[PDB]
């Protein structure tokens, strides 16, 4: 009866998928659908399935969806069974994996409860510490030679033993074993211990990771140090048991239809469209970056731009890197970057790497280093503390941000894209004055050559200025009242940032002509007679490109103007003449 009720469910479901999965008419996407799925599978005949919750919940009024959700553990067998039924029905070595998707909600890790056990669930999270894939039993063939062996089933929960009953025979038993490696179902498990999403963390209870085992083709779909969404299949492991969720559907979710950003944004979407209308704010923007600092503006800018774009992609060869690494050299802290970086703590994908003594646990086996800052700066303090180990890292880092790993557990290159917010002290304190920056900076060897920009910081008191910052600080120190408020609202900023990414600048000819003259002058001008610092290599111009990309990005136009160009070259010229010491 329970057998029958659940079977009624089975038949119902088979009817469902069998029933037209699609009402989309005319231009379409006209029916079926799922049959189509089945076929396309048969095209590749890879023997696992993915399906959308949504349609299903919809169809039955979801009374089905309900029963499914709830009893899902119970329900699995009837399900895959009916699957086998229709496959046999319409199709011609049997392994089936079915994956729902398009679940309506998302559950937090801490949100987990014992009531939800054994029902499918929805969790997204931050991946940690993946594990090599190891075969499984699914069903194992093990029995004694008496009288007959390798009965195929179970070892289900990690035990892994053993043949359960009706041994031997007739040696009837007990006994034990014997396992046929000839007959069983391997799978998978790579398992993974995933961590709750950072932003979420309620103060101060602090993060709690959980483990999930990747079975089936969902295996390897994962990437460490990644936000990813999973379908619950939740349940438990003994320990006394400890719940551990499982994953059918591995989604790495977590651009753009800039609309769908707007649509997504929609509520403000009214508001700052004004900002788009608005002007100058390239100032006000600039008039907002690091309110902390007096002057320090060329930086404030630089950070801002660094946040901005400049595009992946050639396909000749290198996808043209959009990213821009910023170097800022200075006489030491009191703000070092002791100020600027920390400030830069506020941002997405934001990796504040205090010091360079880590040692590259960054990229350990998450790029703490990097893959976490993918599409973000690793604000890596005191590269100096890199000593001699990280220069190795700069390579791939500056290269593909591939992450090469072979511990021989696997040989795996993990690509990355992460902005470089970087830093080091000068050799002897502020040495840069007479001393040439190169070699006054020293350490980064060729990776040095990988740096697009540099702002050299030295402090000479205009007790005017000295006084100024002094006041600034003081007021700040005065808890109140600080009217230090950015020309543009900061939240507003971050939002806008979202906007700017959306734009993808052109343009052509315009500036290309104008620029070409510019570099050539920049260029020649730079070279002759005397010269501040090297070189200027054209990779400068490469920067110039990137730079422009930031400037137009500010314009959002999205197209290039010799104006924007000139600006780039200007700030550029600034940094180089800076190199004159």
């Amino acid at each position: 009866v329970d057998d029958v009720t659940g079977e009624k469910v089975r038949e119902a479901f088979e009817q469902f998928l069998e029933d037209f999965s699609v009402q989309s008419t005319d231009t379409g996407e006209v029916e079926k659908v799922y049959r189509a799925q089945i076929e396309f599978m048969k095209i590749y005949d890879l023997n696992t399935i993915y399906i959308d919750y949504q349609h299903l919940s919809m169809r039955e009024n979801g009374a089905l969806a309900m029963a499914i959700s709830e009893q899902y553990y119970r329900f699995l067998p009837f399900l895959q069974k009916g699957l086998r039924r229709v496959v046999r029905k319409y199709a011609p070595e049997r392994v089936f994996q079915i994956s729902f998707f398009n679940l309506p909600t998302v559950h937090r890790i801490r949100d987990i409860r014992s009531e939800k056990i054994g029902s499918l669930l929805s969790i997204s999270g931050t991946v940690t510490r993946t594990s090599e894939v190891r075969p499984e039993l699914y069903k194992a063939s093990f029995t004694c030679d008496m009288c007959r062996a390798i009965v195929d089933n179970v070892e289900q929960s990690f035990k892994y033993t053993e043949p359960t009953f009706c041994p031997n025979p007739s040696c009837e038993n007990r006994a034990f074993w014997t396992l046929n490696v000839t007959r069983s179902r391997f799978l998978d498990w790579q398992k993974v211990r995933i961590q709750e999403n950072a932003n979420e963390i309620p103060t101060g209870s602090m993060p709690r990771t959980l483990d999930v085992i990747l079975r089936g083709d969902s295996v390897e779909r994962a990437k460490p140090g990644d936000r990813c969404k999973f379908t619950g299949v939740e349940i438990v492991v003994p320990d006394t048991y400890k719940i551990s969720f499982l994953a059918c559907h591995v989604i790495s979710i977590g651009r753009d239809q800039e609309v769908f950003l707007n649509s997504l944004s929609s509520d403000e979407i009214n508001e700052l469209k004004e900002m788009v209308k608005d002007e100058h704010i390239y100032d006000k923007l600039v008039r907002s970056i690091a309110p902390a600092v007096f002057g320090h503006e060329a930086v404030k800018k630089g950070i801002l731009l660094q946040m901005l774009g400049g595009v992946h992609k050639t396909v000749e060869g290198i996808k043209l890197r959009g990213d821009i690494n910023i170097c800022v050299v200075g006489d030491p802290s009191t703000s070092k970057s002791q100020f600027l970086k920390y400030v830069v703590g506020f941002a997405p994908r934001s990796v504040y790497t205090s010091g360079k003594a880590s040692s590259a646990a960054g990229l350990t086996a998450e790029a703490g280093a990097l893959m976490l800052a993918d599409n973000g700066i690793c604000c890596i303090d005191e590269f100096d503390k890199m000593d001699i180990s990280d220069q190795v890292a700069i390579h791939e880092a500056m290269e593909q941000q591939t992450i090469s790993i072979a511990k021989a557990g696997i040989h795996a290159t993990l690509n990355a894209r992460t902005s470089i917010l970087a830093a080091a002290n000068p050799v002897g304190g502020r040495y840069n004055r007479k001393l040439s920056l190169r070699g006054n900076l020293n350490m980064t060897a060729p990776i040095m050559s990988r740096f697009d920009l540099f702002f050299v910081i030295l402090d000479d008191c205009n007790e005017k200025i000295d006084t100024e910052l002094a006041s600034h600080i003081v007021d700040l120190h005065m808890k109140r009242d600080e009217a230090i408020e950015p020309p543009f609202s900061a939240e507003q900023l971050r939002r806008y940032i979202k906007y700017a990414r959306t734009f993808k600048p052109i343009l052509t000819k315009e500036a290309r002509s104008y620029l070409v003259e510019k570099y050539k002058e920049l260029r020649k001008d730079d070279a002759q007679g005397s010269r501040s610092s090297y070189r200027i290599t054209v990779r400068q111009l490469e920067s110039m490109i990137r730079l422009s990309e930031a400037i137009a990005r500010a314009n959002c136009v999205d197209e290039i103007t010799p104006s924007f160009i000139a600006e780039a070259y200007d700030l550029l010229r600034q940094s180089i003449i800076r190199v004159d010491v």
Binding site: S69, P104, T105, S122, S263
Partner: protein
């Protein structure tokens, strides 16, 4: 791959080494002979090899297109076939090795029955001596001896073609023996010994210089009982004729045997039948025979390149043979004929049938930014979207109660102001499922987890405030 060595002076008595040579020709076939009466004269004979000025008539260099050539010299006594040049040393070594072959038959044929028969094979001495050259080496295509016996001086030149014979590993074998002269057994002699013999080829080697003597049975001698219908002259003239050889030798320029195109196609059909059988009936029980898979297996087997065009000549040949269906992608699956299990009897018959049809064909030959405002209205519409997403945000989260913040955040993450606003509007529309209770500590959400989301769906549909607000 044993390579025995014996002096012919010890073969001279013929009562000590006679069975041994038969024992090794039963194994190694081709034998390594050494130190005959000719020694330095063999090197002195090289002076007459530079001639290369003669036509064919089974004599003179054979220029064949290209670099390869065979200076064949027909024996002098036969009437009205002669072209003489210089090569007198060759005429000397002709007799010198005439004794060597007359004795070789005594160390070979005499080992079986009597030597009284072999003298009849040597007495006419009609065999043509053969000098051989290459122009200033892949030039050697695999080849089998023309006469029943071929003695020859050599350096290396020799390989071993793949086969089941001596050294069944069937990789090429190049032996180089100083102060030695290798012998090669003839093809027809294998029939004469009824299967006791073997043949071996040549290969790519730096020394182009080669020399041979094919000592050959008389024009008038039958070969056993089986060759009463085929004399040695007939069969052995057959293969030496073809060969090209080349333009002036097409005389004759028709056997039930292939114009070779046919025989090759036969081989193909063999391999094909084999592999299609293999994937079809084997590889999977349900590996469908796609032409690209195909091309690999026999292209391999053949080691030759199979073209789809070749297949069309095959179906052209046996059309009943295989079904073939161009699928989309344009690839053509081939289908065997209609009877699931193709036994080896099957395809034996098929091979036969094809053979019949071909030989039939041979008979036939023989017989013939306001974008903003857009976003504003769009969001106005997305109200409804939110209802549908919230409705059933509860339902695809099998809870229907919750932390208002939480789901607020998930749905938010789908697309906060807009989010909370929707929270409000829904509350207003459905002040039944939803209650908001401010308590000391804050406003608690209240949500009726049992409320009916279908009715709520239609109600949300109808009361947007009827979309009038």
């Amino acid at each position: 791959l044993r390579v025995p060595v014996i002096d012919l002076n010890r073969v001279s008595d013929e009562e000590q080494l006679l069975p041994v040579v038969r024992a090794i020709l039963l194994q190694h076939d081709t034998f390594l002979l050494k130190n005959y009466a000719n020694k330095a004269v063999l090197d002195a004979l090289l002076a007459g090899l530079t001639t290369k000025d003669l036509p064919d008539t089974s004599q003179g260099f054979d220029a064949n297109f290209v670099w390869l050539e065979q200076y064949i010299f027909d024996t002098d006594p036969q009437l009205r076939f002669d072209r003489k040049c210089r090569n007198e040393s060759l005429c000397s070594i002709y007799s010198r090795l005439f004794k060597l072959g007359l004795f070789f038959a005594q160390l070979c044929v005499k080992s079986v029955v009597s030597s009284a028969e072999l003298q009849d094979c040597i007495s006419t001495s009609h065999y043509a001596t053969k000098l051989t050259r290459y122009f200033n080496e892949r030039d050697y295509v695999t080849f089998l001896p023309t006469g029943v016996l071929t003695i020859f001086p050599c350096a290396k030149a020799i390989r071993y073609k793949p086969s089941t014979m001596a050294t069944t590993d069937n990789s090429w074998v190049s032996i180089d023996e100083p102060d030695c002269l290798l012998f090669h057994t003839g093809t027809l002699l294998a029939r004469w010994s009824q299967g006791m013999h073997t043949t071996s080829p040549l290969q790519i080697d730096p020394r182009a210089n080669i020399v041979s003597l094919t000592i050959w049975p008389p024009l008038t001698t039958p070969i056993s009982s089986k060759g009463e219908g085929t004399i040695a002259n007939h069969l052995l003239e057959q293969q030496i004729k073809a060969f090209p050889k080349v333009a002036q030798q097409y005389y004759p320029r028709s056997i039930l045997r292939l114009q070779d195109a046919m025989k090759f196609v036969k081989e193909l059909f063999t391999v094909c039948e084999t592999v299609l059988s293999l994937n079809a009936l084997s590889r999977s029980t349900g590996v469908p025979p796609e032409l690209h898979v195909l091309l690999p297996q026999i292209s391999s087997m053949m080691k030759r390149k199979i073209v789809q065009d070749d297949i069309l000549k095959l179906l052209t040949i046996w059309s009943d043979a295989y079904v073939v269906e161009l699928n989309s992608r344009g690839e053509l699956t081939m289908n065997l004929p209609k009877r699931d299990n193709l036994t080896t009897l099957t395809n034996k018959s098929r091979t036969l049938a094809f053979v019949e049809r071909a030989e039939s064909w041979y008979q036939q030959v023989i017989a013939s930014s306001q974008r903003q405002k857009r976003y504003q209205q769009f969001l106005a519409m997305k109200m409804t979207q939110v209802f549908d997403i919230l409705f059933s945000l509860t339902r695809g989260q099998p809870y229907t109660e919750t932390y208002l913040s939480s789901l607020i955040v998930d749905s938010l993450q789908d697309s906060t102001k807009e989010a909370s606003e929707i929270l409000a509007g829904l509350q207003g529309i459905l002040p039944m499922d939803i209650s908001v209770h401010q308590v000391d500590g804050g406003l608690k959400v209240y949500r009726w987890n049992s409320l009916d989301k279908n009715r709520f769906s239609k109600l949300l549909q109808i009361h947007k405030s009827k979309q009038q607000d």
